[PDB]
Design a protein around this ligand. Structure first.
Ligand code: HEM
Ligand code: HEM
Ligand code: HEM
Ligand code: HEM
Lengths: 146, 141, 141, 146
């Protein structure tokens, strides 16, 4: 996906302020709360009975950290997302059989979490740049379906 | 279906919006136009640039419709019937676009109401906007 | 919303299915499993091969639920309430998958009922299956 | 997209029996009838007031013929759909701004029309092969969005 230099600037500047220990878990937890069918893939994580249970679940926070790491890796390789996400695509498509619509949903939940954390700093043009990114990541993660 | 807790959460969160209702609606439209440029083609008679009086005025209309839906949350098909006819028949709005505006409304609320936008309230607001979208896409003919 | 003509079209088309109801349901499932292999993971205790007695038996259940919906088309949320709880709560079926099975049901009807599958009836059947899908995805918690 | 030889065989054998003057118009007409918001892009075609009006409209039949030609062209280049649909992608995405979900819908309507025309010959494995094709075409037509 192609970002303008202005968009790249907006994206990288904000990402440097992201709490990498917390934001991924917040996005994954909210995915599980807001789109409850996604809990089907996380039965081994234990207590997901309430939103508080989900957000406080240590496995959700830990796994969220891995997801965010993958988004960070995508931001470093915006011109080669397919190669970057190849192993993850095989995992999520060939092994897990997650419907790729959910890749889009998690990306949009991440965008909501960034808006939550950054407030007015998450301007409409900053959002538009991040939408290009999370769409790129979703399309690359879905490559094994294509 | 919206649960009792969902209705309570949506009323509470929307209550915090206040006199910013129109402003937040306008910001959600702007977010949608910039993020999802396909949606711009529905507004050729609008200048969609920042600070556009037309987008500001339209944001207020959008907000007023959402406020109507909150106030009549148990009777939304009836309350939004005229708006459903408009969007589906006259304007022929693609149903995908409601998901896009709903997402931009969530992002706008998250950016402005950090205390209100808990995971539970995020879930309730998503269900509410999906319910609104279901009504507004119910009249395709 | 389903129009009077939609209800008439759906009742007429489904009336032609007859004693093949269960068979067509089983064929729609098979079409879905082959075309959209992600859907297979919901049925690990099923053998999904051709001629599977489990897919045949399940196709009849699917057909019986659709027949219930046709027979109670003005009261579908109530008629399908138990099935909605099952699919959304217990089974956690991804809402995308209802679009996939609905498409495979249309393809099955088209392949078997060429005289009935007019453009108008295709439209009515699509609206009906979307309405059924809306009810079955209404209970996510 | 990758079809097995068996799938390629099933697809090409059926496509040779397709009425290329009619099937495209039937698919485009049904798109306009079943998904009425798509009529937004065809105001110049005249009478679309009833299903009979749509299906009998000479412009719908003529345009449908062009669409089917593009699908035929895709079937000949299954290993290079992106290049095959590049100009069409620029048209539908950059100029027309059609939401790419509708590319998926038209492909699925085409699959319904093939089922209608071929009946029991349109077996579940033949359908599964055609679903790979129309997904491939939709993804390639949407490339300018990616
Ligand atoms: C942009 C979207 C996504 C990204 C970037 C992503 C990233 C990741 C990463 C980095 C891992 C760790 C793999 C490893 O341990 O090497 C993982 C595992 C996993 N993901 Fe995701 N994921 C995404 C979407 C999803 C969604 C939507 C679901 C389900 C609804 C899902 C279900 C899983 C599961 C169940 C695992 C554990 C697999 C295992 O340990 O064997 N993922 N994902
Ligand atoms: C939450 C969802 C939505 C709400 C509450 C909403 C509300 C409204 C309202 C209140 C009006 C003015 C009605 C009137 O003046 O009679 C309107 C008009 C309009 N809406 Fe929406 N709308 C929604 C979604 C959408 C979407 C997704 C699109 C397209 C991407 C869209 C395109 C339009 C257009 C083109 C007009 C007419 C503007 C004009 O010609 O002046 N709407 N909407
Ligand atoms: C038109 C849409 C659908 C209808 C009418 C329908 C109907 C039914 C019925 C009647 C049952 C049996 C209920 C019972 O025995 O208590 C059932 C069970 C089930 N359905 Fe569906 N269903 C639909 C869509 C789906 C989809 C899209 C999926 C997943 C891709 C799905 C997955 C399942 C599963 C896994 C079961 C349980 C099977 C078992 O454990 O024995 N259903 N459905
Ligand atoms: C797989 C999906 C599709 C294929 C293969 C396809 C193919 C084509 C082709 C071959 C043309 C003729 C271009 C030319 O004259 O050189 C065309 C034009 C056009 N298409 Fe499609 N199309 C698809 C989907 C859609 C959809 C879903 C819409 C709208 C809902 C749409 C709207 C249009 C319009 C308005 C034109 C006329 C453009 C013009 O003459 O300037 N197309 N398409």
């Amino acid at each position: 996906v192609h970002l303008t230099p202005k968009e790249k600037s907006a994206v990288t500047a904000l990402w440097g302020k992201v709490n990498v220990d917390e934001v991924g878990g917040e996005a994954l937890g909210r995915l599980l709360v807001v789109y409850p069918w996604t809990q089907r893939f996380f039965e081994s994580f234990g207590d997901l009975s309430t939103p508080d249970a989900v957000m406080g679940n240590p496995k959700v926070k830990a796994h969220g950290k891995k997801v965010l790491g993958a988004f960070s890796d995508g931001l470093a390789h915006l011109d080669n997302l397919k190669g970057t996400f190849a192993t993850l695509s095989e995992l999520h498509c060939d092994k897990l059989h997650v419907d790729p619509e959910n890749f889009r949903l998690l990306g949009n939940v991440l965008v909501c979490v960034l808006a939550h954390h950054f407030g007015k700093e998450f301007t409409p043009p900053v959002q538009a740049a991040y939408q290009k990114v999370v769409a790129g990541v979703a399309n690359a993660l879905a490559h094994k379906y294509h | 279906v919206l649960s009792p807790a969902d209705k309570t959460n949506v009323k509470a969160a929307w209550g915090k919006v206040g006199a910013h209702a129109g402003e937040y609606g306008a910001e959600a439209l702007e977010r949608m136009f910039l993020s999802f440029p396909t949606t711009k083609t529905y507004f050729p008679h609008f200048d969609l640039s920042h600070g556009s009086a037309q987008v500001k005025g339209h944001g207020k209309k959008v907000a007023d419709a959402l406020t109507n839906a909150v106030a009549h949350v148990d009777d939304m098909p009836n309350a939004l019937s005229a708006l459903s006819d408009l969007h589906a028949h006259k304007l022929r709005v693609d149903p995908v676009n409601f998901k896009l505006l709903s997402h931009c409304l969530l992002v706008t609320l998250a950016a402005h109401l950090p205390a209100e936008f808990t995971p539970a309230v995020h879930a309730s607001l998503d269900k509410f906007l999906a319910s609104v979208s279901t009504v507004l896409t119910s009249k395709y003919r």
